[PDB]
Point group: C3
Chain length 324, copies 3
């Protein structure tokens, strides 16, 4: 696994907690590793996140089953406890299993209804999300988007604001109001922050004044973005998380929170989906698929300030995976 | 071919005789070599097994036609006799074909209703199957199974008895009778033999060579034997076939075949998912005593010098 | 593009002009390079051929739109003029695009109703085609044929003459007339020429055929039978080392009503060849030496000369 240590020792989302019911077995991929996630049948059981590989004969444990608080390999029925230790070999039921019969386990935390995994030793905290515990804000989750592009391209595109009047034409501007005001970007001890920024939206409802939004966002780590939007009657926040499948593939998910009417959920999710799929069309075709750090090399203009700072930040962090 | 010499000089099943009719052209793939099988229209004509490659311009001979005891390439019509010598170049009908105009031919034998092929020099005869000569036993053939796993993984899985109660629950074991008694396994000059052992019915098997297995199962009222043959397509792909014989009622045939198909499909589900796809010889695999037969098999392949399809 | 320099500096066909309508955007692939072809909405606007690549963030320009004689990238709306210089950055509409905001453009010429492209610097003219301005000749074009074989294999198979009786039986021969007369073949500074020879059909049942390649992927073929003459220009697009596009421009001085019969005969013969070409191993064309891979008998004289000519030119792309 060629991921840089700075990536291995971070937290990434691999699933939503609501898709991982008691007694379930789920698969995911993170930084090139196959993972199995499983839970015992008890209510509120913790989630285990292991490499999807039985030490006996290399069969995926995800093809087995959960029984009596153990994951059971389908091939010879070896049973692994929550710590990943083999505690029973059915062929020799009075034999202590070899101390080497042990799954490779990883760190797992549930936070914000999401399943966070660290494949290494977590040097960092899970990013913060201040509105999570605020009862004035409702919450919803997008579907997960599988995207054939580097996770760092996915985050680069989400930090770029100048493309709004073109590929989000009709939602976030139009081709003839495309000028980009000066941008305020900082890379410091809190990571990358984009200062408050006006976005002219296209009018949809002519009875109402132009719902002009003001955005700002912070990245405390390069594959997770906290975004704040103020409209005329409402504040919307989201936690955008990118799962780095490998160097060339990503999963994109949003946790969205807003303090307007709960009835807005359907419209919020449909509007995110329309924006994300427009982005995915560009991401899928971008050349090369990995993000070039500072084919001709990419040109930069003043409105690229944000994405330029992002690329510099990645070089400072020693990122070599998913970039070129 | 780049398979090890020990594998090159052994016999492998590549087809059923019933599929090689007089006049026919069929193909197979063995140890990375594409093969053409063909027969003249004479009744009882022999089967030729050649590399599927016309040496003029590299077109598959299997796209050709069998005319007058010759195989005819479709591109320029060069005609090859039963020994694979080019005997006619139509562009120059008076010319004697040069000596290099020769198909690459291989050894072929029909035995037990199957087409056996040796790509090198057969130093063995075809493995024995005693019940073929016993008219008290009926016979049937499974269909062939194309498996995306190393052939040595396929054979390794078939000798590993401890998985029976877990993935063959109902035909070869009970999840409540999963304990495995002391296995007796012996690797000889006669190959690998597993001693008689009880299945919850007594079973034993012998492999005279790494990819052919003879297996014998005795119930209270009936004996069943089969010859299990693995075609090594290449390092990562196999064809599996069984010749099954039994001395019980002949009406049991469809049940027997159903049982085999169910057991094979359960095995394929596991084989397809196993990693790596090639059989590791001796993270690494762990061994408990009920791995006795599978460890002995891996040691045998290592002793034999097998490097194709392994590790 | 790891293509040899002698390939990069030659001309190749990448489209028919009828495929490139005013205002259109189409794509092509040449020697590993992805191409965008586009035209203004004006009638008889010139054709631009560029690398399919926006220099800003690497989006294919082929996903854009033609507007006001410019190609507009869809990502951030930069506009490139017919020379491929960026003329407008909409985020900074009063700013002058940096000099580096320039598409990678290629040489393009329309000739014989075909779009010719040179990725490097042209050292030759587009091949000559004498009958193009003869008003006694009608013209027609085949469709384009994508072939999963090296373009040198495609060209090799079309100068092979001894296979006509076998895979083209009923159109270019039959198995009762499979014997090949002596072949006149000359390779020199001006390419490969095959002298007149007799093709059997259904004096007698025959045509006389010759052909010439001034360059290794373009062939001029001439066939005469009973006062009617057919010529064609066969052009192979080298997509990469393992893939190609085949096109024909056909001209003939007989009845106009032969057009659809000519097209069907060409199509049948081409599909018969593709069946062979897709089965051949290796995919790339094997050159000559310093179970045999290849054997050569006297009727192979023209394909042997072709292989020798390719080594002499220094071709390593698409051969082996
Ligand atoms: N994390 C992010 N959520 C999005 C919010 C929600 O609005 C929509 N429609 O997605 N709006 C917005 N302008 N930013 C900048 C890029 C897209 C996004 N980034
Ligand atoms: N050569 C072999 N044939 C197969 C048959 C399957 O039996 C039934 N009843 O389907 N019998 C048997 N004991 N096994 C163990 C593994 C697979 C197999 N080995
Ligand atoms: N340049 C060439 N065009 C093709 C046409 C095919 O003729 C017809 N009637 O379809 N004519 C011809 N002599 N040949 C032989 C090789 C393929 C081809 N070479
Ligand atoms: S492979 Fe998992 S128990 Fe044997
Ligand atoms: S390739 Fe077989 S005869 Fe020419
Ligand atoms: S990528 Fe083409 S304008 Fe930005
Ligand atoms: Cl449980
Ligand atoms: Cl995608
Ligand atoms: Cl015959
Ligand atoms: Cl499979
Ligand atoms: Fe976007
Ligand atoms: Fe099994
Ligand atoms: Fe042909």
């Amino acid at each position: 696994t060629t991921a840089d240590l700075i990536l291995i020792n971070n937290w990434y989302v691999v699933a939503k907690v609501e898709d991982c019911r008691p007694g379930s077995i789920t698969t995911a991929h993170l930084l090139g590793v196959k993972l199995v996630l499983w839970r015992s049948h008890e209510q509120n059981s913790p989630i285990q996140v292991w490499q999807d590989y039985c030490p006996h004969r290399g069969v995926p444990l995800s093809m087995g089953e959960v029984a009596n608080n153990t994951l059971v390999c389908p091939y010879h029925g070896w049973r692994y406890n929550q710590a990943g230790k083999c505690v029973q070999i059915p062929a020799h039921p009075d034999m202590v299993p070899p101390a080497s019969a042990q799954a490779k386990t990883y760190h797992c935390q549930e936070r914000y209804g999401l399943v966070w995994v660290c494949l290494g030793n977590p040097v960092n905290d899970i990013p913060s999300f201040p509105e999570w515990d605020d009862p004035n804000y409702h919450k919803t989750y997008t579907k997960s988007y599988l995207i054939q592009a580097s996770p760092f391209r996915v985050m680069d595109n989400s930090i770029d604001v100048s493309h709004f009047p073109f590929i989000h034409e009709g939602i976030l501007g139009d081709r003839n109001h495309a000028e980009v005001e000066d941008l305020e970007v900082k890379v410091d001890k809190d990571g990358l922050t984009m200062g408050k920024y006006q976005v002219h939206t296209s009018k949809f409802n002519n009875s109402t004044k132009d719902d002009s939004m003001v955005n700002w966002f912070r990245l405390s780590h390069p594959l997770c973005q906290y975004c704040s939007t103020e409209a005329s009657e409402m504040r919307t926040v989201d936690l955008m998380v990118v799962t780095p499948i490998d160097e060339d593939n990503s999963v994109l998910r949003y946790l969205i929170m807003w303090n307007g009417s709960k009835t807005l959920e359907s419209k919020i999710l449909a509007d995110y989906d329309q924006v994300i799929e427009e982005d995915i069309r560009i991401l899928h075709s971008q050349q090369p698929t990995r993000l070039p750090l500072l084919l001709p090399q990419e040109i930069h203009v003043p409105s690229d300030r944000c994405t330029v700072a992002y690329r510099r930040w990645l070089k400072e962090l020693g990122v070599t995976y998913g970039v070129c």
